[PDB]
Amino acid sequence: GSSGSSGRRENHQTIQEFLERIHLQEYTSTLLLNGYETLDDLKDIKESHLIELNIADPEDRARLLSAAESLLSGPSSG
Secondary structure (H helix, E strand, O other), rough: OOOOOOOOOOOOOOOHHHHHHHOOOHHHHHHHHHHHHHHHHHHHHHHHHHHHHHHHHHHHHHHHHHHHHHHHHOOOOO
């Protein structure tokens, strides 16, 4: 991924991949630039946020929120 390596991750999902699943990677830059680098940050994102992030569209907002909810709110052993 990133030009330079950082370390390791623990079942941590990235926005780049979290968006690809919902075909919303088109908002990646918008999210990353804003600060949303990993789901950890998305756990704080809300409906309004998306709107301000150029996601005035509900299709994306919902797909973005509903998606995050499943990841965060969902204790799955795996």
